Assembly symmetry: D3
Homo-oligomer: 109 residues x 6
């Protein structure tokens, strides 16, 4: 269809925030491989496991694919919420990334 | 009633973004006449046609009046959407302004 | 549960905006006592009356307690709205604080 | 020259913030006439006195003209500061507007 | 050294804004190939020419490489400015991209 | 003097960001005691050590007091920088907090 730049600005800002937090983690005790390609951010942990954060423009969503599964987030009333459970994006990502890093990594707005 | 400054801040920011993009277009190949008076932004293209972007505070809306018609936008879940079709504001305005300028003008958040 | 940092960032920003406006009022003709403790902002007016603005994280709300009563606000479609009447936050607070100060204090996004 | 949209976005946001605060004041005890024309905001107080807030793009400035005089503000290190005294914009405007309204009006970021 | 997330948030936001504007241009009369890889945004115009916008973290800069040359921008007093001429980022990019597209493309904050 | 609300909005936003990150850390493996009183944020780690982040309005600064010492930050060209070394705020705080928690805590804009 037509690009929705209001959606893209918000969704791209999520990818960027995630990348900055990983950069900080990598300054310290972490070694997470990070790749940003198009609208896809791929994190590869030291144990070889992965988390991908990406855009789904057709539903104006941001998605996570992690060891725990695949989760979809829509921006509703000021924040990104899991379309099934309502769980807020950064809290879920923190949970999944901490599981996979074996060392806390704290994502926060 | 009482002024809703949260609405006004968002709606005024739309008018301002539209004006900046037109200013840039006017630095280049365009000659669009721009007038900002109160909460009304009037664009007059070289062919004499017009687009008006204005506020409708009673419904917390931003409106377009263009050759294509009159469209009303409400801020829902992080963006300005056409109250009838759901089309996002800047994508619609891009379409209408490009029709009337005869040369692409690209509005974007 | 888990801290919702997207909610907290927005709600904390309300407390901060309220405090800045009171600081400005206090530079001039006002003498409002202000206390910020945790997620609770307490305003004590010259006549001894009070307004408290605080967070209610379980419902992702910001609350007012004032002479006029207790009001609850949720962030819906870009702004903080009274969960019962729909009244926008800063307009309501302006009303209540002006009643209690006996001199206009203007809160605005 | 060429329009500086980064400057214009910041400077226009000042005009908009000033207008919202006046709108709130006008909901209450004030009757300030407000006119926004192009990049010029004219406030006319009940006593007939005036304050104008406007843009000066050639120096990327925002200016005040008030009873107290004419003051020029540049954005330096995160805020708008008087080019002669360093006084921050909203604090100065609060001072001047309160003088002219005869009733406190509190401008705040 | 250590990742500067305040710099990265601002610089990444430039890349994202540029990409959104190109997306809009591509909805209309343009066909610009866009690739985002790491902190590098590559635009390939219909005539085969290129513009790259990328990060230079060691000096907290954003760079352009275009037909017109290589330009470096630092964030100073609220905006991205050419380190040699002071020209603001989006105005320069508009100039270079319009040269290379042969059809106006308007970048704006 | 007069309250500088442009400074206060930026400085308060630092305190709020720090608090949100600690809240997230506390959802996981951490137990950091957090107290926000006025413009002072006190963090008490499990080993009894402390970090305080607070405002210094007279110089428009944000300060850290940590085991490593006392550091002062001013907002210059888009970010908070150590007035002696130029080190950016969140990178320094990450370093100090990680030292004192004994488990990485990642602060990021
Ligand atoms: Na919303
Ligand atoms: Na700055």
């Amino acid at each position: 269809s037509m690009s929705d730049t209001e959606y893209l600005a918000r969704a791209e800002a999520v990818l960027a925030a995630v990348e900055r937090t990983v950069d900080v983690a990598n300054d310290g005790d972490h070694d997470i491989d990070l790749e940003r390609n198009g609208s896809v951010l791929t994190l590869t942990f030291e144990n070889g496991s992965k988390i991908i954060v990406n855009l789904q423009p057709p539903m104006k969503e941001v998605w996570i694919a992690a060891k725990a599964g695949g989760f979809h987030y829509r921006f509703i009333d000021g924040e990104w919420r899991d379309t099934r459970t309502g769980t807020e994006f950064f809290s879920a990502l923190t949970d999944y990334a901490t599981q996979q890093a074996g060392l806390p990594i704290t994502f926060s707005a």
